[PDB]
């Protein structure tokens, strides 16, 4: 693991930070959308039931 830093000797640092930023954004939105699309984990519809709001 001591030489993983040599990644920066082979890959341009901007391209890596952009590619990894892009990845983490799309992944994070996808999981939140999967959970909103899941009846047991949609936090807005859960709290709507918990407090007798229109749901």
């Amino acid at each position: 693991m001591s030489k993983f830093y040599k990644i920066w000797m082979i890959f341009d640092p901007r391209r890596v930070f952009v590619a990894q930023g892009v990845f983490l954004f799309l992944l994070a939105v996808m999981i939140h959308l999967i959970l909103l699309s899941t009846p047991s984990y949609n936090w807005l519809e859960i709290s709507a039931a918990k407090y007798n709001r229109v749901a």
């Binding site: 830093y5 990644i7 920066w8 000797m9 082979i10 890959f11 341009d12 640092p13």
Partner: peptide
């Protein structure tokens, strides 16, 4: 390839 040194990396 990147032109970074071993220290910059």
């Amino acid at each position: 390839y990147t032109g970074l040194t071993d220290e910059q990396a």
